[PDB]
């Protein structure tokens, strides 16, 4: 599996802003990109599958785009209750790596 | 990302998937199934003759040198009403067996009776005139 | 409903041993295909291993455990196990068992082969520590 | 649907249940199973799984055993056809204690020189393979003399067990039971096959399995039903027990002439004190045992039951535990294991012995000269209930017991199935036959 | 013997034309520099080790792919 890094490593906004994280990988890896996002004393919770698609039961809060090289996860709206470490994970072979993971919180 | 295995099925395991997967493996089982002293002398005995029964029935339905064979005997939906893909893509070798276990014979009759006797009447007749 | 119980673990020396056992139901665990995954205090989750659906007749391990940790699984008691052998401090993380999206032994191509496209379910993990 | 056209396929992986004869193969090197004509055995053997299509197995119901029971037999009887007839030692013997009674000096007089070289020639005897003569002295003569006559085995004849394997023969096939939890009978969903069985070796026991194989993780207690008081209960045990046998009296033998051209050995003197056959069993590693077998059986059979009592039931082979360490027979008082209810065994030596029932023609074992060693362990063992009783969970006395040697191969071949495979088979398809 | 000739297509014959490609690397001689210039014991025994190579592509490769086509075929 390719190496993904993800940008910024810290990620803030005010409660209602728009906030993104960039993440990318070294090669192609086509679409084959979960999105997790993690919050303290839970196991890492996935919202979009294959790059693009939420995961059923998740609230239209969130997308994500980008193929290839270059994707981004897209938060709607900032909320304190949305307050975690993000992680772009690739799947394309048996490695599943994930990447650095991306903290975003409330501005303060 | 995938796992794969080395080559191609083992031996029979696709018995129990739908009978359009299992095709894929017919050359490899075909090939595994055909190929103190005395009682091993009598089970060869028997083993030709088992080799040699499947033989002429496929030499006879015109089939021989074939594990895929087109007949032209119509298939009486009495015996099964599902279509194409409700059997081949939905139903395994052996569920699919049970299902018209009890027809074996009469088809098979009905191959040879019907279809081969035509096949080398009109033969003859062609290759006179 | 779906519950993975993940037990277990606890405090061990280096060089020492223990065994995982994540029990699970509410789903098909013979068919679906399961993940180990781990994450140190300070890190990010770090992809572990994975055991196909079925009986698991394909593995592939992260070259930071291969050859030190082994996979196996039960069927009829619905358990996912980790051998945890020959531990090192590094190896200080809280253990999870998740299951793939798929994990399936398709026939295709004459052949078996295990689809994954990544862990969506999951239980809580639990911690093991090597020290001394 | 579709206009639909009969398709002939070959290939088709399907098969019903059939019994037939598997082929032997061995390790490959006149011993009874050391047949001069078996396959050698495939140094990589293959195994694959299912795993779409799951099996009923049923240990009750494989024909293998069959096999086996009559096979075993016949080579038996082949390897040891050449042999020495006891008839002209059905002579009545004069005898006295041996000083030191199990062993009696006895003399007698025959052939006196019918065309050869012999006399005398007293010699010791056991009190096991003798019948008092009740109207003598008491005298004794030769068990057998009322019955069959007899033959002292060729010493030429090894009789250590050999793990023969078996494969399948051409359109048929081994299914193997994986399920660790797999008992008697049932859809064993963790089905594979097999090409070919490991070896099994032909261990002759009652009362306990030894050299066996061992149960996967915990003791697992087989029956065909836990209910009916007709059948037995197998016991498979998780580790074995540690059980080491001696026979410390070093003996001497000598070859005596019985007529021209023929010799017969007897047992000489002995060296040294008299002692007991007898073996040395682990307590710690017994009585372990006995727990986990108790803590499985309380799932059937209650969990206050008191079991294990000392044995009992049969005829005296059946009653003693035996085996045949070193050539010779053993057969000792399994009391001592179950001599307390919910180890040193002592124990005699037979020599007229009976393959698991012989009729007429039957095997002598020739004397053994110097002393016995052997160790071994046991992997698994036979219960026997003891009858009808007070429906309470207050006794079920679990004796030790079967004398069925069928069951020796069974505990094992439990594991497979023989199928036969069909592969001419038929199926719709789109289109004809381009046929002109 | 008649098992492989009709697996391979070539019952009946004794001389018949398969679609496995050879390979020079097992000999880079020349069409006649073999069939005008090499006896039979000769020749077996310079490709002797490719037996079973040969033999399986046949089979793995030719045979599989007559039989999924030829169905395919006549189905469409
Ligand atoms: C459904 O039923 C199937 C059928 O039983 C069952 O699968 C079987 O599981 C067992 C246990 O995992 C498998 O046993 C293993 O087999 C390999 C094969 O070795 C042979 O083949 C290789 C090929 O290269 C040869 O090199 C080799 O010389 C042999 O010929 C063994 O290598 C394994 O041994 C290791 O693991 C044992 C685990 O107890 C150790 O005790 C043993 O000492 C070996 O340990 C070494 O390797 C470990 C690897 O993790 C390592 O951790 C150790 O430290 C040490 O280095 C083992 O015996 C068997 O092959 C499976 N059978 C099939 C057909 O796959 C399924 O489990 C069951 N499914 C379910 C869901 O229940
Ligand atoms: C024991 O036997 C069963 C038989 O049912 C096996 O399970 C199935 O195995 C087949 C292949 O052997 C799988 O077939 C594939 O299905 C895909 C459809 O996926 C959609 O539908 C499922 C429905 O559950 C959804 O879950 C899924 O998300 C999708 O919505 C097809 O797309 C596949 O097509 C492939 O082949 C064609 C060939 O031309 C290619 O062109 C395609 O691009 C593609 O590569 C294929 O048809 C089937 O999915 C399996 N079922 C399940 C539920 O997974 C068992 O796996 C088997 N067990 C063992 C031990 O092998
Ligand atoms: C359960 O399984 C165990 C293990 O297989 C069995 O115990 C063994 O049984 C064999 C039977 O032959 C014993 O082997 C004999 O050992 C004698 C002395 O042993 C020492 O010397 C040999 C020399 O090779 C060493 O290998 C061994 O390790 C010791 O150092 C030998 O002298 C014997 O050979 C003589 O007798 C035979 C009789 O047939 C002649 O054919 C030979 O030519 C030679 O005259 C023989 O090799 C072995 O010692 C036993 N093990 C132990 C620890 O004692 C159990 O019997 C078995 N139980 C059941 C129920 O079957
Ligand atoms: C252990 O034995 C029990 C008792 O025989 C098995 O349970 C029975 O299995 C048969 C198989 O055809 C069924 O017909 C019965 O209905 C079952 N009885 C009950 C009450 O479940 C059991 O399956 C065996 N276990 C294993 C793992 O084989
Ligand atoms: C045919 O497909 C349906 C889909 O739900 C399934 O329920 C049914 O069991 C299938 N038939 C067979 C033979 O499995
Ligand atoms: C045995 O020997 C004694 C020797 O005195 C003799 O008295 C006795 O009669 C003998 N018995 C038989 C069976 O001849
Ligand atoms: C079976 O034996 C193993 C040997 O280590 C032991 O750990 C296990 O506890 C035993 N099973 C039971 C039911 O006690
Ligand atoms: C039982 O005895 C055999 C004799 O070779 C030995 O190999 C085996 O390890 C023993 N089993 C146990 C559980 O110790
Ligand atoms: C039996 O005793 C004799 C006495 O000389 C001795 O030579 C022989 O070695 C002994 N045999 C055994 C097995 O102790
Ligand atoms: C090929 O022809 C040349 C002609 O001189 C000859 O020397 C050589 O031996 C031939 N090869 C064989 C296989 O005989």
Redesign the interface.
């Given at each position: 599996?390719i190496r993904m890094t993800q940008s910024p490593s810290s990620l803030s906004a005010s409660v209602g802003d728009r906030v993104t994280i960039t993440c990318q990988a070294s090669q192609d890896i086509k679409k084959?990109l979960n999105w997790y996002r993690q919050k303290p004393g839970k196991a890492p919770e996935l919202l979009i599958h294959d790059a693009s698609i939420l995961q059923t039961g998740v609230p239209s809060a969130f997308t994500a785009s980008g193929s290839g090289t270059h994707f981004s996860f897209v938060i709607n709206k900032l909320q304190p209750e949305d307050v975690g470490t993000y992680f772009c994970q690739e799947?394309?072979?048996?490695?599943?790596t994930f990447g650095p993971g991306t903290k975003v919180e409330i501005k303060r | 990302?995938?796992?794969?295995?080395?080559?191609?099925?083992?031996?029979?395991?696709?018995?129990?998937?739908?009978?359009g997967?299992?095709?894929?493996?017919?050359?490899?089982?075909?090939?595994q199934?055909?190929?103190?002293?005395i009682?091993?002398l009598q089970?060869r005995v028997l083993?030709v003759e088992?080799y040699l029964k499947?033989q002429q029935?496929?030499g006879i339905?015109?089939?021989?040198?074939?594990?895929?064979?087109?007949?032209?005997?119509?298939?009486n939906?009495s015996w099964?009403?599902?279509?194409?893909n409700?059997?081949?893509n939905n139903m395994?070798?052996?569920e699919?067996?049970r299902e018209?276990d009890n027809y074996?014979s009469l088809?098979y009759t009905?191959?040879e009776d019907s279809?081969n006797q035509?096949?080398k009447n009109e033969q003859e007749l062609?290759e006179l005139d | 409903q779906v519950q993975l119980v993940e037990s277990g673990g606890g405090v061990v020396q280096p060089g020492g041993s223990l065994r995982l056992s994540c029990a699970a139901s509410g789903f098909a665990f013979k068919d679906f295909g399961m993940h180990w995954v781990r994450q140190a205090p300070g890190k990010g989750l770090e992809w572990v291993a994975?055991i196909?659906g079925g009986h698991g007749?394909?593995?592939?391990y992260s070259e930071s455990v291969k050859g030190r940790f082994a996979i196996t699984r039960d069927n009829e008691k619905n358990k996912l196990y980790l051998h945890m052998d020959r531990l090192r401090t590094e190896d200080t993380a809280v253990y999870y068992c998740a299951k793939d999206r798929l994990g399936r032994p398709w026939?295709?191509?004459?052949?078996?082969?295990?689809?994954?496209?990544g862990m969506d379910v999951w239980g809580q993990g639990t911690t093991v520590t090597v020290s001394s | 649907?579709?206009?639909?056209?009969?398709?002939?396929?070959?290939?088709?992986?399907?098969?019903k249940e059939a019994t037939?004869?598997l082929?032997?193969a061995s390790d490959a090197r006149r011993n009874v199973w050391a047949?001069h004509?078996?396959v050698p055995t495939d140094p990589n053997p293959?195994e694959?799984?299912?795993?779409?299509?799951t099996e009923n197995f049923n240990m009750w119901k494989n024909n293998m055993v069959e096999q086996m029971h009559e096979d075993i037999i016949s080579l038996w009887d082949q390897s040891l056809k050449p042999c020495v007839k006891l008839t002209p030692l059905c002579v009545t013997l004069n005898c006295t204690d041996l000083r030191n009674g199990e062993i009696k000096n006895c003399s007698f007089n025959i052939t006196t020189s019918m065309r050869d070289k012999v006399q005398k020639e007293y010699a010791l005897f056991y009190k096991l393979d003798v019948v008092p003569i009740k109207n003598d002295n008491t005298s004794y003569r030769l068990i057998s003399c009322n019955t069959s006559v007899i033959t002292q085995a060729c010493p030429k004849v090894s009789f250590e067990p050999i793990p023969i394997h078996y494969c399948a023969?051409?359109?048929f096939?081994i299914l193997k039971c994986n399920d660790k939890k797999f008992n008697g009978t049932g859809p064993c969903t963790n089905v594979s096959?097999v090409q070919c069985t490991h070896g099994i070796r032909p261990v002759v026991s009652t009362q306990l399995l030894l050299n066996g194989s061992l149960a996967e993780e915990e003791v697992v207690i087989r029956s065909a039903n836990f209910t009916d008081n007709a059948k037995i209960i197998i016991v498979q045990l998780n580790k074995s027990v540690e059980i080491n046998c001696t026979r410390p009296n070093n003996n001497t033998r000598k070859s005596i002439h019985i007529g021209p051209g023929r010799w017969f050995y007897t047992t000489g003197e002995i060296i040294g004190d008299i002692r007991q056959a007898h073996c040395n069993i682990s307590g710690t590693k017994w009585n372990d045992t006995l727990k986990q077998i108790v803590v499985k059986l309380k799932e059937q059979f209650g969990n206050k039951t008191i079991v294990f009592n000392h044995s009992s039931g049969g005829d005296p082979e059946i009653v003693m535990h035996s085996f045949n360490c070193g050539g010779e027979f053993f057969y000792c008082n399994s009391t001592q294991l179950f001599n307390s209810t919910w180890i040193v065994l002592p124990c005699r030596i037979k020599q007229i012995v009976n393959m698991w029932q012989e009729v007429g023609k039957a095997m002598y074992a020739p004397p053994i000269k110097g002393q016995i060693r052997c160790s071994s362990n046991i992997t698994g063992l036979i219960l026997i209930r003891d009858g009808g009783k007070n429906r309470s969970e207050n006794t079920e006395i679990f004796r030790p017991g079967g004398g069925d040697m069928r069951d020796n191969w069974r505990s094992e071949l439990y594991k497979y199935k023989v199928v036969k495979?069909?592969?001419?088979?038929?199926?719709?398809?789109?289109?004809?036959?381009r046929?002109?």
């Open positions: 599996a084959s799947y394309e072979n048996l490695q599943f | 990302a995938v796992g794969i295995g080395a080559v191609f099925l083992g031996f029979l395991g696709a018995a129990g998937s739908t009978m997967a299992a095709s894929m493996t017919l050359t490899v089982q075909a090939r199934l055909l190929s103190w002293g009682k091993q089970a083993a088992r499947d029935l496929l339905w015109g089939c021989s040198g074939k594990l895929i064979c087109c007949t032209a005997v119509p298939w939906t099964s009403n599902k279509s194409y409700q059997i081949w395994t070798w052996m699919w067996e018209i074996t088809i009905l191959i279809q035509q096949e062609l | 994975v196909g007749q394909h593995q592939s026939n295709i191509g004459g052949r078996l082969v295990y689809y994954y496209y | 649907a579709e206009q639909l056209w009969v398709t002939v396929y070959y290939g088709v992986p399907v098969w037939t004869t082929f032997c047949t004509a078996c293959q694959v799984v299912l795993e779409n299509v023969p051409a359109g096939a096959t495979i069909e592969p001419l088979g038929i199926a719709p398809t789109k289109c004809k036959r046929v002109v």
